[PDB]
């Protein structure tokens, strides 16, 4: 029936094409998953409401295309976000390097105090993992930004990631 | 043969039956209001019945308006699904092969798709715009 909520938080997922931004959103909001790779056309969003401590928060999770052809479309939506998750692929070193450029995209187009969270997705494929958890953790600490390894495939930590993202938006404002 | 557009039409069907249940409580509620006006003439039993009726009327009013949005949301989510599919089929061609009338309607679907997503966001926002005045109304 009617869904009554305490706060609305806008979130953004950004990161290289292929790292699993859409599968994470599918896992979190619809509790599904697909091995097919369908590139995101521009942007999309989905709703999930969550119970965090006292309150019901409604999460508008925006999903952005990672392909450069859509960056001009996707940077419109940086500004009005309260929270931006930067996602990389555990089995791709260059996707973890490119985290830095996505952070500069945040500083360029987001609001000054936007919240930030780093996510190394695809933790499932232990074999071809290349980016070490501590290098990434170390990088994330001393930006004052939290960090988490997720697998949208088997569902590890993906709610934790979004919950942590919500927590830190609630501390603020 | 369909897929989790099944979730969409079940939710649609559920919302319509919920609207119908509200328009009948609204008719019922307004039939009582005219009864207690004429009983205006202890009176504590009926003064508090009309107090409950005021709240009840306001709840059904807020609830109807939200259900109507939830129904517009799923109609947009369905249109988005059709546009997105249509655009992807046009992208299967390589761009050398599409003549100028392809690009024009490929462009057209993309903007229509982005516009459908914008109205989804305008409904999300309007849900808060009405949620913000509801706490300005519940301050009493
Ligand atoms: N093993 C594994 N594969 C995953 C995981 N998450 C996503 N993938 C795979 O990686 C591919 C890319 O996922 P997708 O969500 O489409 O990527 P994206 O980040 O949205 N790309 P884009 O920016 O183009 O939309 C998919 O084929 C999916 O199967 C995960 O946790 N584990
Ligand atoms: Mg995608």
Author numbering:
A (entry chain B): 1 to 173
B (entry chain A): 533 to 573, 582 to 680
Relevant lines from the article:
Rab proteins, the biggest subfamily within the superfamily of small GTPases, are major regulators of vesicular trafficking in eukaryotic cells. One such family of effector proteins that was reported to link Rab proteins and the cytoskeleton is the Mical (molecules interacting with CasL) family. In this publication, we present a thorough biochemical and structural analysis of a Rab effector domain termed bivalent Mical/EHBP Rab binding (bMERB) domain. The results show that the domains probably constitute a Rab8-effector family involved in endosomal trafficking, and the Rab-binding specificity can be well explained from the 3-dimensional structures of complexes determined in this work.
Interestingly, whereas Rab1 contains a glutamate near the N-terminus (Glu4), all Rab8 family members contain one or (in the case of Rab10) two lysine residues in this region that point towards a negatively charged patch in Mical-cL. We therefore tested whether these N-terminal residues of the Rab proteins might determine the specificity of bMERB domains towards Rab8 and its homologues rather than Rab1. We constructed a chimera of Rab1 containing the 4 N-terminal aa of Rab8, thus exchanging the negatively charged glutamate for a positively charged lysine. The x-ray crystallographic structure of this Rab1 chimera (termed Rab1R8N) in complex with Mical-cL clearly showed that the helices 1 and 2 move closer and adopt a similar conformation as observed in the structures of Rab8:Mical-cL and Rab10:Mical-cL. Additionally, ITC measurements showed that the chimera had an approximately five-fold increased binding affinity compared to Rab1. In contrast to Rab1, the chimera Rab1R8N bound both EHBP1 and EHBP1L1 in aSEC experiments, thus clearly indicating that the N-terminus is important for the interaction and contributes to the observed specificity of bMERB domains towards Rab proteins. However, after mutating the 4 N-terminal residues of Rab1 to the corresponding sequence of Rab8 (the resulting chimera is called Rab1R8N), the structure of Rab1R8N:Mical-cL shows a similar conformation of α-helices 1 and 2 as in the structure of Rab8:Mical-cL. (c) Consistently, ITC measurements show that the affinity of binding increases approximately five-fold after mutating the N-terminal residues (Rab1:Mical-cL: KD = 5.2 µM; Rab1R8N:Mical-cL: KD = 1.1 µM; Rab8:Mical-cL: KD = 0.23 µM). In this regard, we showed that the N-terminal residues preceding the RabSF1 motif contribute to this specificity, an observation that has previously not been made in other Rab:effector interactions.
